[PDB]
Design a protein around this ligand. Sequence first.
Ligand code: HEM
Ligand SMILES: [Ca+2]
Ligand SMILES: [Cl-]
Length: 595
Amino acid sequence: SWEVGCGAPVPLVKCDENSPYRTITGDCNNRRSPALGAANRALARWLPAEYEDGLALPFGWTQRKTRNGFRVPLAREVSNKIVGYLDEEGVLDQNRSLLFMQWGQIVDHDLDFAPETELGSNEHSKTQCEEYCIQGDNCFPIMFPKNDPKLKTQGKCMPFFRAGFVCPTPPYQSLAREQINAVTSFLDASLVYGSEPSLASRLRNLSSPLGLMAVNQEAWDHGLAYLPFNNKKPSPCEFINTTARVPCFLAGDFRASEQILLATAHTLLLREHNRLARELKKLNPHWNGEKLYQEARKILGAFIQIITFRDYLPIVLGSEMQKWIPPYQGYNNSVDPRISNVFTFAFRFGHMEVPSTVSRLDENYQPWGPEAELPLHTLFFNTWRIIKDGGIDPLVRGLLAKKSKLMNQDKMVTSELRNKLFQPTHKIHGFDLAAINLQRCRDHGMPGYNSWRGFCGLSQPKTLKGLQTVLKNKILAKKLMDLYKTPDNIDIWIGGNAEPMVERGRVGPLLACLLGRQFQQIRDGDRFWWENPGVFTEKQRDSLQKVSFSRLICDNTHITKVPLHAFQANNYPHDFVDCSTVDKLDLSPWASREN
Ligand code: HEM
Ligand SMILES: [Ca+2]
Ligand SMILES: [Cl-]
């Protein structure tokens, strides 16, 4: 029946109709249905959850209950036999910079986050999911297949805890278990400011009346601000170099310090806030903090929307962009603005775009110091390499002049993430991002590959040759069906990402359909989208259309040469221009007079 009710881990929020800015939580964006898009609600289902028992237990749970008549292959076996590779030569994308990979993680972290259940803290369950590898409740461990090298050096499993879900959190029964989205579904810069108002206030400098964002007081980057430290322990950023004991950064997203370039990108966005806030004050000295914060928070929001929709999505989706994301026709309040559960896996295409090294580049874009180049795995929850070894300018340079990994059917995920992922809670650089994603698809009751081909109106192959024709890869198709036995059983993550790339893009048909459809929804379903008439003056909107990631860098670093298109492959000095050449974001149209 109409179980439209279910939702009692939530207060619900009286909406002040006339309010001219967004909520932190995303409530009230939709007037008829205010909870839509808002953080700490269920991920939308584009298709019914598919669970071993049609309730919550994930496929592969019971050593006995098949899927369509076959055992599901161990997550890690799939990783080992399909996802892995050795030779990092020839893998880099000759036309996408590292910034391409980085903006994908930024946009993702803005849109969706299903955290693990935090019941299991104040409990041994953490430690003997770890050691004993005993599957129970929300401990869903990743078992190693026969002849797995980790069998020798790491024990029997890598640990894994199930995603948080709505209404209950420990107790029984489900209409069908729906995982939570802990951040606002609207592309709203929620990774900068927060999705809970608790954390949002905590990120603000309320001392000044300038509605500035809080900055580091311990340490500075040639005068330019850093994020404030998360001063609460344990800190996995302390754990990786105790000598340095430099904690993780505090941002509106929990994951800001997962890797050193995400915290770099976060730090550019913060400075952009305070830059905007204290520039408005010059222009409009009467405006209090609450109006400096919100009016700068409103511009950062739109910057992200422009860069995403004008520069990112076009070079991800390619041929397929215009079919899914045609010109803006205005707010449709009948559009579902929610992130879907499948999208949180479609957007994980990013993982095959991450290369095995990160470089630091001097003012002539040459190797900075004698360890200019570092293995990615040494940069998980690494904040000290920024604070005690050069700042962000050397790191932002690499972002511009180093390349993304090109996704590759026989070189899918670098060993840096497939074998040497660091998890915040555990103690080894020993985890497998790829096997994690596969385990997680099952945890979330993901429909198989063909259900989603069906969904997007593409062929549902049932044969080895049917699958050879789609993946355009005799060996990949052979390897997949040796594991899954039917294309119906192939986990959506590796299904989507196995397809060749659509033209002038970096995803195959299935993922372009899933991704395109969600960004279409994120735009059309937002009352506060920057092009939506009313939100901005005409004069503001012509002055916002000239933003660039190039611009953002020039204004928030001591870097002076930048490419005109920061996402394509740009070599120094040919493709780099001076900063007096880009186009500033002019805020003349933001002048409040008086009465
Ligand atoms: C380490 C990790 C990265 C880089 C060094 C990285 C990078 C990306 C990019 C570039 C993405 C998109 C273009 C992207 C999307 C999503 N990721 Fe992923 N990522 C790293 C590590 C992780 C880890 C760990 C997770 C959690 C996975 C789990 O189930 O435990 C992770 C997730 C995601 C994700 C899902 C987010 C959510 O809603 O929970 C993406 C959409 N990444 N990453
Ligand atoms: Ca958001
Ligand atoms: Cl879904």
